[PDB]
Swiss-Prot record, chain B:
Assembly behavior: The RNAP catalytic core consists of 2 alpha, 1 beta, 1 beta' and 1 omega subunit. When a sigma factor is associated with the core the holoenzyme is formed, which can initiate transcription. The rRNA transcription and antitermination complex (rrnTAC) consists of RNAP, NusA, NusB, NusE (rpsJ), NusG, SubB, ribosomal protein S4, DNA and precursor rRNA; S4 is more flexible than other subunits. In pull-down experiments interacts with CedA. (Microbial infection) Interacts (via flap domain) with Escherichia phage lambda antitermination protein Q; this interaction renders bacterial RNAP resistant to transcription pausing and allows it to read through termination signals.
Purpose: DNA-dependent RNA polymerase (RNAP) catalyzes the transcription of DNA into RNA using the four ribonucleoside triphosphates as substrates.
Region of the whole protein represented: 399 to 448 of 1342
Protein name: DNA-directed RNA polymerase subunit beta
Chain segments annotated as transmembrane: none
Biotechnology remark: Co-administration of salinamide and rifampicin or salinamide and myxopyronin suppresses the emergence of resistance to both antibiotics.
Membership in a protein family: Belongs to the RNA polymerase beta chain family.
Superkingdom as given in the UniProt entry: Bacteria
Species in which this protein is naturally found: Escherichia coli (strain K12)
Description of post-translational modifications: Acetylated on several lysine residues in the presence of glucose.
From Swiss-Prot, chain D:
Family statement: Belongs to the RNA polymerase beta chain family.
Practical and industrial applications: Co-administration of salinamide and rifampicin or salinamide and myxopyronin suppresses the emergence of resistance to both antibiotics.
Quaternary structure and partners: The RNAP catalytic core consists of 2 alpha, 1 beta, 1 beta' and 1 omega subunit. When a sigma factor is associated with the core the holoenzyme is formed, which can initiate transcription. The rRNA transcription and antitermination complex (rrnTAC) consists of RNAP, NusA, NusB, NusE (rpsJ), NusG, SubB, ribosomal protein S4, DNA and precursor rRNA; S4 is more flexible than other subunits. In pull-down experiments interacts with CedA.
Function: DNA-dependent RNA polymerase (RNAP) catalyzes the transcription of DNA into RNA using the four ribonucleoside triphosphates as substrates. Resistance to the antibiotics salinamide A, salinamide B, rifampicin, streptolydigin, CBR703, myxopyronin, and lipiarmycin can result from mutations in this protein.
Result of altering residue 17 to K: Disrupts the enzyme's active center
Protein name, entry field: DNA-directed RNA polymerase subunit beta
PTM text: Acetylated on several lysine residues in the presence of glucose.
Organism for this UniProt entry: Escherichia coli (strain K12)
UniProtKB/Swiss-Prot annotation, chain H:
Domain of life of the source: Bacteria
Chain residue ranges for the region called Sigma-70 factor domain-1: 1-75
Top-level taxonomy: Bacteria, Pseudomonadati, Pseudomonadota, Gammaproteobacteria, Enterobacterales
Gene: rpoD
Protein name per the record: RNA polymerase sigma factor RpoD
Purpose: Sigma factors are initiation factors that promote the attachment of RNA polymerase to specific initiation sites and are then released. This sigma factor is the primary sigma factor during exponential growth. Preferentially transcribes genes associated with fast growth, such as ribosomal operons, other protein-synthesis related genes, rRNA- and tRNA-encoding genes and prfB.
Organism (species): Escherichia coli (strain K12)
Swiss-Prot record, chain K:
Molecular functions (GO terms): DNA binding; DNA-directed RNA polymerase activity; magnesium ion binding; zinc ion binding
Catalytic activity annotation: RNA(n) + a ribonucleoside 5'-triphosphate = RNA(n+1) + diphosphate
Covered residues, full protein: 454 to 1376 of 1407
Reported impact of residue 285 to C/H/P/S: Resistant to antibiotics salinamide A and B
Name recorded for this polypeptide: DNA-directed RNA polymerase subunit beta'
The keyword Acetylation belongs to this UniProt entry's keyword annotation: yes
Alphabetically ordered keywords of this record: Acetylation, Antibiotic resistance, DNA-directed RNA polymerase, Magnesium, Metal-binding, Nucleotidyltransferase, Transcription, Transferase, Zinc
The organism of origin for this protein: Escherichia coli (strain K12)
GO cellular component: cytoplasm; cytosol; cytosolic DNA-directed RNA polymerase complex; membrane; transcription elongation factor complex
Length: 76, 50, 49, 49, 38, 99, 50, 98, 151, 142, 923
């Protein structure tokens, strides 16, 4: 999705907190705590996070739930 | 000498070279020409003429 | 501008009722200036430079 | 300068705007190659060290 | 580095001016001109 | 002309402009407004501080780039610190308050 | 050698360059014709006449 | 009535005030080299800054007229000062000289 | 930063020459008067007791001379920025504000009433901000760090 | 010739009859027609002009052709301003004709020639008063 | 390049590198080239083909009388292209082709319709590219600059971004390719001197000779000669231009099989003109025609023209004059741009801080948007004005209780299409100005219109967006102020009305009084006359003055071009409501009137002299026209007790003297008033700045403050008094007025508040004070927008609206209760304290406020935080005041945060600051 992020804004309509969510995810991807959920095409993590947003797998709520999941798992 | 030449040419006198300092008859002619243009028998000069 | 005698008008602006007020300025190469100018009331005023 | 053979026509938008298209033939003949003589200066001062 | 907000402006009192300053500059000289130490 | 990193000025710790010295273009007020027209706050923020006047921020960001991390640490622009010092040089107390 | 954009002529009211192109093409045509008559080395007379 | 009450009006009634005016309208005293500086700066908080010989164009003189504030003590200041003819000898040279 | 101990209290230019001269309006003293005071041409009576002179009255050279000769003691007057600072320190903001409120309760004239109100607001704002007027006159002068005025 | 002010209308030069009084119904109708035609043409020309200005205006990337495209417009607008100034003069002349006070000099009661009115139908003064006023004008102006 | 205003003649560009990951994302999402194709000013695309492309496509689509393969039938576009590339057919030749277009008929389904269309080869080859959703019609035509732009626009509206982008790229590539294949150039002989140039020139010269001969005769002073010559030259110039263009356009007299025909010529220069790639008629004029008259320095037009063309050669004099004109223009250009910069900067200073803070304020107020139906037609239709605005309330069909648009809905294109299917005229739309939320605006009141398609997203900085949109244009606008005074589309005349279209006649704001013949003579000053069309809509609108006899009244159908009203302009009749004899009151001869009386038919020319012309005894005597009956007693106006005593103003020519039974509606006395009847058009750049600085205009028109019977006052002191006495409220409102003011209402009349009393221009301040907010905002919007459209620069009203909101930032309190009773205070603080009072038990009191309107400069000067004000105001002053005040700056704004180098509160950083707000005053 390195042409037009129009569909990601159609998923999240703020068009501003969209970029913030994508930044949190793409920094969680760069610092290799996690791995990309999409088959990489030798892309960098920017368009990877955008592609992950557009398919509905990640948003703010899914990010928070999975984050608290990993937190409570690592607590044990 | 240039200043005097321009002064005498402005008042339409045949004489080209004068004594540099302002002779007073000249001044009188000056007020005559000023009141002439004030009457309208002449054009005013433009600060831009070569 | 060359030294000598110049007759300026400075028209239009002069009181926004016309009153085209003329003035002759006598400028030497080096030295103080002479000015003969008008007024709305047609009075001839002298100014030292 | 120099006189070149020009043709007025649009050639696949490489002269889109006032830009100019030119043939390898001009560079090959070295007719628009300029010589520039630049000056450089190295000055050796004496510091207190 | 603090995370700040609200920048306040007021007349400086003489005791605050003394407060910021670390020392008094009594002589106008700048540098020793021979050895350029201050 | 291109410049990555180079020499800075004495009083205003901005990068020198020109050809003899590496250069270093200049983001003007109009460009600031342009970025403001977008919701582009982080690019403006970096351009204004980490890229020009913040010494600690700029060195830390250099190291971050070398390490392959992309984060930021804006700090206080040096021009603003100079401003405070110049106003405080007058009889005017300007303090950064806290809550 | 050079391909110049035509859309620059009519709105840029410099039409002299077009006449320049024509007359210059004509001059090179003359030059070519002389080159041809010299490469065959016709005769002094014929170059002289032309 | 004075020689400045007719000026201050013009200043904002005709937009500007040419140098010629502020020159001849002065009283007799404080002509000292550039004593005008203070009255020009006060007149500047009303909108004047006329050019060499009073040109004109330029519909822009009211932004700067608004950019010079209501608080017009100056008016009072100038009035008092130019209505007493106490020599405004600011330059310390003159006062020490006396 | 550094600082300099000034021997003679000096006035802060900004609070004098700025179009609204805040020392002047705080002290209700015209600008020309304060100017004449600082440059040492005339005195001002700082608390002139049970005498024939007010507290913000200017005295000329030989009027002050004839007065001192006549009134040797119980008579405090001075010259210069230190005089201005002294009279500034002694003025009671709060009590004078209360006087102004009593005037407002008693005074009925349109333009005078407005002016009164303006002064009242001014003093109120000043005493709310917590700045004491005497600070407008500088005693210690800070000096900018060297690196910002480099050599 | 289709270039004057009588040409604009389909009218031909008048011809004062032997014992014809000066201002009669027919002459007044004639001049009213002339002025109305003149006006309506000028207004339609202004409409053309404005449409042209509205169509052309664009943002040019070259500073030496923005001036080119804004140096013919300045002249056009000059002509339009002048004609706008003349539309008020035509309106006033239509008011004098409608009020039946047309054809005489405003300075002196003398009547203005018919041929002069067919020359410049907006004429307000006789040639003599016109000349004297023109002198006074140029003198108070220049 | 069009977006950058860039040209390839050595212009340079800078390239910056976004470093952080968030910056990379910010660049890719909001700033990416492909995301911003729509202009922020209007909704239309920016990236349209520029010049070479359009030439290529134009060449491709044009049709020709005769070529190769006339009347061939091709099975599809691919075969067309195969035919062209083999050289068996010309790129343009009229042909029958089978084409399958797709249609969005269902809920987003594509339905293939496949049939035979009559088109060109070229048009089919171009149709190859077109994406599925577009109707063929699009390409079937000439395909010029306009058409191509409309093509892109429709592509965007139907399919969406991704396809529009791909289709634009395709258009570029194909256009370049086929432009190269066309091989269009420009030769010296391509610009043809019209055959009849010298003819018109000789005619004009003979006419000037006649005018010189008629000058020497002494029928014209020098001025008439100069003006007349210049005018004859102008006419000769435009005619010569038109003759050249006529020669040029349609000169290809190409032959079909047998006899011949004539057609749209293929002259390369002409195609460059007509396609809209470069050149306009005027430049073609200057190449092939006479380059008209030129102006000397002083602005005066030199009598002798050039008459030469660049194809031919000019001489010394002509070139010299052209130098005058050229250099004057070139020198003016620089200054013009450098002052437009100032306008844009002082327009950004006022609005910078405005940001979308709330989602929905919940206001019911809004502005009534109509189709601006200026007289004859719809100068600008509704759909353009209302597209992308939220609705304030439900709009009802032409039949009550049939809601077709639920409360606040965003009106996109399809809603507008539906809105067109009905015939609703007026729609309340929520406006930014009336938005209720303090410290910003609400998403809904603003609406969608942006580079993207959707409703505004919370957080975006709308203030600087609007300032930028209003500042970028303003360079097309001619620098120096001009005047036109044309008003082309007038009312045909000033007397009679002429209905253009056959519709029902419907009156607004009137009370007629039937006369003896039975005509509805209107006695209302504010009367308008609209026209409803076949299907219930307002087609025509006319303005009928006081006293105008009517012919056909209300309801009856008027056929096309019927004169429905008639009146003499410079004549205000006084109209009687009841019948009987006119009785003379206070009309003494010598004291107040001058006896000019006629014979049998009863004419007079009585002049009611004012105090100056009135003798010493007739100072207070108001001469009147008594309405008496046959018996004597004052007959009262119907329903009211007032005996109509018409105080006849100066020069009231009373025709009907005492002794003429007046019918109910006969004119009492004709009063001639030569009021100026033309609306001089004004324009250019400085007028805009002047409109934005809200400068009270020249001799201003006056309004009425309260209602009630008006009256005169102290006679002839240098301003006659007008006393508005309220029927119910207290009487005592006296307003002095200069004598030169013309009055529209009679003394013994009951006016309403805020009707016009004198003619001329109204000062926006009065508009706000009397009429209120929506009226001033509408006035400003319309007045500026007229200037901007005069040059053809399109701007959406919302930006002007935000600015106007910034101008109304301040109010002044007249009541009491918690404030200082006179302080200019922002309307937000007053509105919050009013909310406090009204929610709390106590009123306090109060407090009633009135809005004030400030010009953008002062409004900018009214900033709260002192770091901004020091950033652009006299720093010393603001710093000194803030130092004495001990003022505390929370910074809260954009420019402050810029200066301190922290996150702007707009856009991507709004969340950050919103977070901090929750962290403050929290745990
Ligand atoms: C020498 C020359 C005058 C030549 C002249 O006067 N020829 C007169 C020739 C007259 N004749 C021979 C032709 C006969 C008459 O014309 C007969 S008739 O009346 O015309 O019938 C004058 C005219 C302009 C003068 C210079 C300027 O001021 C600037 C400057 C002023 C300084 O203070 C001194 C130096 C400068 C450089 C001057 C030098 C010198 O002073 C100049 C060149
Ligand atoms: N502006 C423009 N774009 C074109 C054009 N032609 C193709 N594209 C699109 O650009 C994108 C580039 O894709 P590729 O570069 O070929 O695929 P790749 O990265 O794996 O090598 C494609 O969509 P995409 O990036 O995969 O879209 P998405 O799925 O990422 O949202 C393609 O559809 C064109 O002419 N103009
Ligand atoms: N096209 C056209 N315009 C006319 C004609 N006659 C008069 N005008 C314009 O009407 C204006 C009014 O002219 P007047 O002041 O009445 O002088 P006038 O008696 O000689 O007509 C003039 O503006 P102005 O400022 O005096 O002109 P100028 O000084 O700029 O040259 C003039 O340009 C005409 O026949 N044709
Ligand atoms: Mg360029
Ligand atoms: Zn006469
Ligand atoms: Zn809202």
């Amino acid at each position: 999705a390195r042409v037009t992020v129009q569909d990601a804004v159609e998923k999240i309509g703020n068009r501003f907190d969209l970029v913030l969510v994508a930044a949190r995810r793409a920094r969680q991807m760069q610092v290799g705590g996690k791995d990309p959920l999409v088959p990489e095409e030798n892309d960098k993590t920017t368009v990877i996070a955008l592609r992950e947003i557009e398919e509905g797998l990640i948003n703010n709520q899914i990010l928070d739930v999975r984050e608290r999941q990993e937190q409570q798992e690592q607590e044990a | 000498a240039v200043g005097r030449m321009k002064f005498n040419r402005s008042l339409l006198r045949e004489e080209i070279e004068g004594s540099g300092i302002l002779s007073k008859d000249d001044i009188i002619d000056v007020m005559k020409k000023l009141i002439d243009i004030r009457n309208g028998k002449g054009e005013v000069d433009d600060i831009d003429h070569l | 501008r060359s030294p000598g005698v110049f007759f300026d008008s400075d028209k239009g602006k002069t009181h926004s009722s016309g009153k085209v007020l003329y003035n002759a300025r006598i400028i030497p190469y080096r030295g103080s200036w002479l000015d003969f100018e008008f007024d709305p009331k047609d009075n001839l005023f002298v100014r030292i430079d | 300068g120099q006189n070149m053979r020009v043709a007025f026509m649009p050639w696949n938008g490489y002269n889109f705007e006032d830009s100019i298209l030119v043939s390898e033939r001009v560079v090959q003949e070295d007719r628009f190659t300029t010589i520039h003589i630049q000056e450089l200066a190295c000055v050796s001062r004496d510091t207190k060290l | 580095t603090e995370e700040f907000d609200a920048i306040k402006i007021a007349l400086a009192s003489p005791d605050m001016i003394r407060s910021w300053s670390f020392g008094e500059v009594k002589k106008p000289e700048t540098i020793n001109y021979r050895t350029f130490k201050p | 002309h291109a410049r990555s990193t180079g020499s800075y000025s004495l009083v205003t710790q901005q990068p020198l402009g020109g050809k003899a010295q590496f250069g270093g273009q200049r983001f003007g007020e109009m460009e600031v407004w342009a970025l403001e027209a977008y919701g582009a706050a982080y690019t403006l923020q970096e351009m204004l501080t980490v890229k020009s006047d913040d010494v600690n921020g700029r060195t830390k960001m250099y190291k971050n780039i070398v390490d392959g991390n992309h984060q930021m640490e804006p700090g206080m622009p040096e021009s603003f610190n100079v401003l405070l010092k110049e106003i405080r040089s007058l009889g005017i107390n300007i303090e950064l308050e806290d809550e | 050698d050079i391909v110049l954009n035509p859309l620059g002529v009519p709105s840029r009211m410099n039409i002299g360059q077009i006449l320049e192109t024509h007359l210059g093409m004509a001059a090179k045509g003359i030059g070519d014709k002389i080159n041809a008559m010299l490469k065959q080395q016709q005769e002094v007379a014929k170059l002289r006449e032309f | 009535q004075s020689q400045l009450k007719l000026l201050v009006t013009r200043g904002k009634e005709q937009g500007y005030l040419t140098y010629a005016e502020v020159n001849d309208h002065l009283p007799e005293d404080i002509v000292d080299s550039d004593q005008i500086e203070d009255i020009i700066q006060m007149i500047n908080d009303m909108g004047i800054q006329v050019m060499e010989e009073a040109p004109d164009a330029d519909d822009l003189m009211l932004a700067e007229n608004t950019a010079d504030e209501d608080a017009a003590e100056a008016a009072a200041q100038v009035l008092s000062s130019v209505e007493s003819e106490i020599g405004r000898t600011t330059d310390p040279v003159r006062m020490y000289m006396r | 930063m550094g600082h300099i101990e000034l021997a003679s209290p000096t006035a802060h230019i900004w609070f004098l020459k700025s179009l609204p001269s805040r020392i002047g309006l705080l002290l209700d003293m015209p600008l020309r008067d304060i100017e004449r005071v600082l440059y040492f041409e005339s005195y001002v009576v700082i608390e002139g007791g049970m005498t024939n002179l007010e507290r913000q009255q200017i005295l000329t050279e030989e009027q002050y001379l004839d007065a001192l000769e006549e009134f040797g003691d119980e008579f405090d007057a001075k010259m210069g920025a230190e005089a201005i600072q002294a009279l500034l320190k002694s003025m009671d903001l709060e009590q004078e504000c209360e006087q102004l409120r009593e005037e407002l309760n008693e005074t009925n004239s349109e333009t005078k009433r407005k002016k009164l109100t303006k002064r009242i607001k001014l003093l109120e704002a000043f005493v709310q901000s917590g700045n004491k007027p005497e600070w407008m006159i500088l005693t210690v002068l800070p000096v900018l760090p060297p690196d910002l005025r480099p050599l | 010739s289709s270039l004057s002010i009588l040409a604009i209308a389909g009218v031909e030069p008048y011809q004062e009859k032997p014992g014809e009084e000066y201002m009669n119904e027919a002459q007044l109708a004639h001049f009213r027609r002339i002025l109305e035609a003149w006006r309506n043409q000028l207004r339609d020309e202004v409409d053309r002009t404005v449409t042209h200005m509205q169509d052309e205006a664009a943002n040019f990337p070259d500073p030496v052709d923005r001036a080119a495209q804004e140096e013919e417009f300045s002249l056009e607008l000059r002509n339009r301003d002048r004609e706008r100034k003349l539309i008020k003069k035509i309106e006033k002349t239509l008011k004098k004709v409608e009020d039946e006070d047309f054809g005489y000099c405003e300075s002196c009661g003398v009547e203005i020639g018919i041929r002069r009115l067919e020359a410049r139908p907006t004429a307000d003064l006789c040639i003599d008063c016109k000349t004297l006023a023109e002198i006074r004008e140029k003198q108070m102006a220049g | 390049c069009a977006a950058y205003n860039a040209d390839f003649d050595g212009d340079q560009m800078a390239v910056h590198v976004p470093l952080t990951l968030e910056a990379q994302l910010e660049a890719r999402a909001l700033m990416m080239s492909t995301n911003n194709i729509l202009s922020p000013a209007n909704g239309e695309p920016i990236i349209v083909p520029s010049q070479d492309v359009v030439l290529g496509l134009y060449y491709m689509t044009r049709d020709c009388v005769n070529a190769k393969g006339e009347g061939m039938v091709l099975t599809g576009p691919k075969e067309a292209e195969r035919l062209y590339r083999s050289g068996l057919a010309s790129l343009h030749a009229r042909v029958k082709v089978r084409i399958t277009e797709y249609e969005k008929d269902a809920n987003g389904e594509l339905v293939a319709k496949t049939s035979l269309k009559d088109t060109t080869v070229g048009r089919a080859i171009l149709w190859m590219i077109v994406p599925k959703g577009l109707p063929y019609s699009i390409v079937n035509q000439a395909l010029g600059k306009k058409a191509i732009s409309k093509m892109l626009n429709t592509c965007y509206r139907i399919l969406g971004l991704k396809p529009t982008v791909i289709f634009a790229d395709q258009i570029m590539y194909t256009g370049f390719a086929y432009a190269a294949r066309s091989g269009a150039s420009v030769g010296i002989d391509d610009m043809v001197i019209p055959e009849k140039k010298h003819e018109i020139i000789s005619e004009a010269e003979a006419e000037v000779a006649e005018i010189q001969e008629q000058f020497q005769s002494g029928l014209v002073t020098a001025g008439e000669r100069y003006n007349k010559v210049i005018d004859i030259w102008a006419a000769a110039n435009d005619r010569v231009s038109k003759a050249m263009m006529d020669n040029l356009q349609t000169e290809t007299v190409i032959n079909r099989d047998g006899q011949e025909e004539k057609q749209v010529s293929f002259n390369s220069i002409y195609m460059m003109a007509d396609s809209g790639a470069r050149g306009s008629a005027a430049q073609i004029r200057q190449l092939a025609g006479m380059r008209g008259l030129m102006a000397k320095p002083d602005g005066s037009i030199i009598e002798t023209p050039i008459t030469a063309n660049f194809r031919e050669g000019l001489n010394v004099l002509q070139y010299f004059i052209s130098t005058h004109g050229a250099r004057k223009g070139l020198a003016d250009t620089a200054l013009k741009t450098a002052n437009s910069g100032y306008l844009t900067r002082r327009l950004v200073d006022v609005a910078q801080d405005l940001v979308v803070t709330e989602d929905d304020c919940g206001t019911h107020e809004g502005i009534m948007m109509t189709p601006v139906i200026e007289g004859g037609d719809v100068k600008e239709p509704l759909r353009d004005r209302v597209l992308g605005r939220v609705t304030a309330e439900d709009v009802l069909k032409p039949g009550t209780a049939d809601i077709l648009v639920p409360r606040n809905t965003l009106l996109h294109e399809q809603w507008c299409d539906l809105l067109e299917e009905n015939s609703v005229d007026a729609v309340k739309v929520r406006s930014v100005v009336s938005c209720d939320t303090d410290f910003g605006v609400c998403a809904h009141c603003y609406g969608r219109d942006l580079a993207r398609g959707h409703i505004i997203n919370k957080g975006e900085a709308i203030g600087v967006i609007a300032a930028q949109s209003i500042g970028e244009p303003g360079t097309q606008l001619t620098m120096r102020t001009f005047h036109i005074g044309g008003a082309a589309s007038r009312a045909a005349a000033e007397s009679s009305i002429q209905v253009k279209n056959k519709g029902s006649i419907k009156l607004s704001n009137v009370k007629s009084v039937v006369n003896s013949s039975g005509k509805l003579v209107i006695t209302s000053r504010n009367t308008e006359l609209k026209l409803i069309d076949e299907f219930g809509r307002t087609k025509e609108s006319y303005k009928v003055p006081y006293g105008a006899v009517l012919a056909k009244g209300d309801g009856e159908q008027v056929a096309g071009g019927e004169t429905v009203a008639n009146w003499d302009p410079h004549t205000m009749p006084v109209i009687t409501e009841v019948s009987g004899f006119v009785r003379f009151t206070d009309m003494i001869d010598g004291q107040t009137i001058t006896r000019q009386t006629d014979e049998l038919t009863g004419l007079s020319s009585l002049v009611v002299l004012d105090s100056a012309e009135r003798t010493a005894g007739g100072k207070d005597l108001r001469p009147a026209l008594k309405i008496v009956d046959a018996q004597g007693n004052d007959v009262l106006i119907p329903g009211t007790d007032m005996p109509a005593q018409y105080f006849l103003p100066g020069k009231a020519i009373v025709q009907l003297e005492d002794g003429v039974q007046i019918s109910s509606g006969d004119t009492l006395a004709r009063i001639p008033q030569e009021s100026g009847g033309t609306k001089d058009i004004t324009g250019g750049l400085p007028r805009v700045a002047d409109l934005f600085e809200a400068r009270r205009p020249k001799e201003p028109a006056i309004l009425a403050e309260i209602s009630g019977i008006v009256s005169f006052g102290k006679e002839t002191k240098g301003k006659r008094r007008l006393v508005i006495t309220p029927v119910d409220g207290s009487d005592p409102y006296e307003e002095m007025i200069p004598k030169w003011r013309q009055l529209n209402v009679f003394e013994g009349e009951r006016v309403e508040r805020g009707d016009v009393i004198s003619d001329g221009p109204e000062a926006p301040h009065d508009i706000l004070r009397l009429r209120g907010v929506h009226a001033v905002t509408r006035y400003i919007v319309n007045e500026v927008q007229d200037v901007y459209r005069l040059q053809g620069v399109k701007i959406n009203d919302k930006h002007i609206e935000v600015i106007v909101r910034q101008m109304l930032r301040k109010a002044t309190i007249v009541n009491a209760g918690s404030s200082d009773f006179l302080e200019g205070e922002q309307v937000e603080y007053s509105r919050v304290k009013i909310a406090n009072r009204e929610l709390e038990a106590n009123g306090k009191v109060g407090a009633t406020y009135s809005r004030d309107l400030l010009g953008i400069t002062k409004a900018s000067l009214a900033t709260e935080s002192f770091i901004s004000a020091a950033s652009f105001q006299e720093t010393t002053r603001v710093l000194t005041e803030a130092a004495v005040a001990g003022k505390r700056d929370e910074l809260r704004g954009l420019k402050e945060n810029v200066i301190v180098g922290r996150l702007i509160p707009a856009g991507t950083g709004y969340a950050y600051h919103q977070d901090r707000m929750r962290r403050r005053a929290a745990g």
